[PDB]
Design an enzyme around this catalytic site. Structure first.
Site, PDB file in Angstrom:
ATOM      1  N   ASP A   1       0.842  -1.197   0.000  1.00 35.00           N
ATOM      2  CA  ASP A   1       0.000   0.000   0.000  1.00 35.00           C
ATOM      3  C   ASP A   1       0.879   1.249   0.000  1.00 35.00           C
ATOM      4  O   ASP A   1       1.390   1.647   1.050  1.00 35.00           O
ATOM      5  CB  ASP A   1      -0.929  -0.028   1.213  1.00 35.00           C
ATOM      6  CG  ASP A   1      -1.844   1.176   1.290  1.00 35.00           C
ATOM      7  OD1 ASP A   1      -1.914   1.951   0.314  1.00 35.00           O
ATOM      8  OD2 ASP A   1      -2.519   1.326   2.333  1.00 35.00           O
TER       9      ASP A   1
ATOM     10  N   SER B   1      -0.471  15.590 -12.245  1.00 34.53           N
ATOM     11  CA  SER B   1      -0.709  15.205 -13.628  1.00 34.53           C
ATOM     12  C   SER B   1      -0.972  16.441 -14.475  1.00 34.53           C
ATOM     13  O   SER B   1      -1.544  17.431 -14.008  1.00 34.53           O
ATOM     14  CB  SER B   1      -1.901  14.245 -13.730  1.00 34.53           C
ATOM     15  OG  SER B   1      -2.229  13.984 -15.087  1.00 34.53           O
TER      16      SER B   1
HETATM   17  N1  LIG Z   1      -4.303   3.393   0.438  1.00 35.16           N
HETATM   18  C1  LIG Z   1      -4.224   4.091   1.705  1.00 35.16           C
HETATM   19  C2  LIG Z   1      -5.037   5.382   1.650  1.00 35.16           C
HETATM   20  C3  LIG Z   1      -6.415   5.342   1.784  1.00 35.16           C
HETATM   21  C4  LIG Z   1      -7.145   6.518   1.732  1.00 35.16           C
HETATM   22  C5  LIG Z   1      -6.494   7.726   1.544  1.00 35.16           C
HETATM   23  C6  LIG Z   1      -7.281   9.029   1.491  1.00 35.16           C
HETATM   24  F1  LIG Z   1      -8.618   8.763   1.441  1.00 35.16           F
HETATM   25  F2  LIG Z   1      -6.997   9.753   2.612  1.00 35.16           F
HETATM   26  F3  LIG Z   1      -6.911   9.736   0.386  1.00 35.16           F
HETATM   27  C7  LIG Z   1      -5.118   7.765   1.411  1.00 35.16           C
HETATM   28  C8  LIG Z   1      -4.389   6.590   1.459  1.00 35.16           C
HETATM   29  N1  LIG Z   2      -6.371   1.612   1.119  1.00 38.44           N
HETATM   30  C1  LIG Z   2      -5.929   0.683   2.141  1.00 38.44           C
HETATM   31  C2  LIG Z   2      -6.946  -0.448   2.215  1.00 38.44           C
HETATM   32  C3  LIG Z   2      -6.741  -1.605   1.483  1.00 38.44           C
HETATM   33  C4  LIG Z   2      -7.669  -2.631   1.543  1.00 38.44           C
HETATM   34  C5  LIG Z   2      -8.795  -2.490   2.334  1.00 38.44           C
HETATM   35  C6  LIG Z   2      -9.821  -3.615   2.399  1.00 38.44           C
HETATM   36  F1  LIG Z   2     -10.086  -4.044   1.131  1.00 38.44           F
HETATM   37  F2  LIG Z   2      -9.333  -4.653   3.139  1.00 38.44           F
HETATM   38  F3  LIG Z   2     -10.960  -3.140   2.980  1.00 38.44           F
HETATM   39  C7  LIG Z   2      -9.004  -1.330   3.059  1.00 38.44           C
HETATM   40  C8  LIG Z   2      -8.077  -0.305   2.999  1.00 38.44           C
END
Ligand SMILES: NCc1ccc(C(F)(F)F)cc1
Ligand SMILES: NCc1ccc(C(F)(F)F)cc1
Length: 330
Positions: free
Chosen positions: A35, A199
């Site tokens: 992630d 972008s």
């Molecule tokens: N994949 C992690 C993640 C999930 C949500 C956000 C948000 F919503 F804050 F932009 C950033 C990073």
């Molecule tokens: N963006 C981070 C994240 C990744 C996967 C999930 C899930 F799918 F497990 F809910 C939640 C949040």
């Protein structure tokens, strides 16, 4: 040193990607969601509330000869989708595709939200944003990438996500056989702890390219592409019968429609997302309404270049002292 590991979609829609990770001595292999939008390495464990575990592989620190409890440390995280988890912290040896880090903070979940319990294929997350976002208290901990940086041949990792197919995460080197043409690098702002970039614009299908600055984050941990309402309206206006549905929570379209491609700008270069990448299938089993892969960021507060966009490119996360992002066609 370098590392290389295969990453695999968890289902037929590419909702997320899992990558095997070795933790502890002897190794316990868990399939983690890499992630780049978060900075905690956390796992289902023997400490997780039993009712909250449904098929996940668990990390058992008591069976690892290298695990140490980080005395007094706790963690708690909430993701932008409303998911959350929390627990305590161990340090242990962590290896990804041959690349080994000793003394990595491994955050052991005591409590996880329902969305994690229901995802039997994801054993945890491996955060790859900047360490300023790590939630360990009272002593913040470093990410796997930050801990590995010094020993890497080059302070980079690359994401090569597949469309309905496996892909690759590489650490410490750039595979020049994995992309076509040249890599275009663009500046990154770390001020919010994300891989945040700008972008240079977009096009819908074969339409004219619109030069306009779109600030957003490169987030392997988010499934879809979230862009400003003006851009998203311009895209779905080209799909007959598409509409924004409040009950569904986004743009839907008749499953019989063909979707146009979406192009986004990286400096002077262009990355083209094929229209098939934007189809996320029926909203419910048997429905003829399908869910769109490009959605509005208006309710989120930030634009997100998630898997839908990243899997159309070879992406370089350059963690040099001045970080940059590289995009190439493939
Ligand atoms: N994949 C992690 C993640 C999930 C949500 C956000 C948000 F919503 F804050 F932009 C950033 C990073
Ligand atoms: N963006 C981070 C994240 C990744 C996967 C999930 C899930 F799918 F497990 F809910 C939640 C949040």
């Amino acid at each position: 040193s370098t590392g290389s590991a295969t990453t695999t979609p968890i289902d037929s829609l590419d909702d997320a990607y899992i990558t095997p990770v070795q933790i502890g001595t002897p190794a316990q292999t868990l399939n983690l969601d890499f992630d780049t939008g978060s900075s905690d390495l956390w796992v289902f464990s023997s400490e997780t509330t039993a009712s909250e575990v449904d098929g996940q592989t668990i990390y058992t620190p008591s069976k690892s000869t290298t695990a140490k409890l980080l005395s007094g440390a706790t963690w708690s995280i909430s993701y932008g989708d409303g998911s959350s988890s929390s627990g305590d912290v161990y340090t242990d040896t962590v290896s990804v595709g041959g690349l080994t880090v000793t003394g990595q903070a491994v955050e052991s979940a005591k409590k996880v939200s329902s969305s994690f319990t229901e995802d039997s294929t994801i054993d945890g997350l491996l955060g790859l944003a900047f360490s300023t976002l790590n939630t360990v208290s009272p002593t913040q901990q470093k990410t796997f990438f930050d801990n590995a940086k010094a020993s890497l041949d080059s302070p980079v990792f690359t994401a090569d996500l597949g469309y309905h197919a496996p892909g690759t995460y590489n650490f410490g080197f750039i595979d020049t056989t994995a992309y076509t043409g040249s890599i275009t690098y663009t500046a990154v702002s770390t001020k919010q702890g994300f891989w945040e970039w700008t972008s240079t614009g977009y096009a819908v299908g074969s339409g004219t390219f619109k030069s306009t600055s779109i600030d957003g984050i490169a987030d392997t941990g988010t499934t879809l592409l979230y862009l400003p309402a003006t851009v998203v309206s311009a895209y779905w206006a080209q799909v007959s019968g598409a509409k924004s549905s409040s009950s569904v929570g986004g743009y839907v379209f008749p499953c019989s429609a063909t979707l146009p491609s979406f192009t986004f700008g990286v400096g002077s270069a262009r990355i083209v997302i094929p229209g098939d990448y934007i189809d996320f299938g029926p909203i419910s089993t048997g429905s003829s309404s399908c869910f769109g892969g490009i959605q509005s960021s208006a309710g989120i507060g930030i634009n997100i270049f998630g898997d839908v966009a990243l899997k159309a490119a070879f992406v370089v996360f350059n963690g040099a002292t001045t970080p940059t992002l590289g995009f190439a066609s493939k």
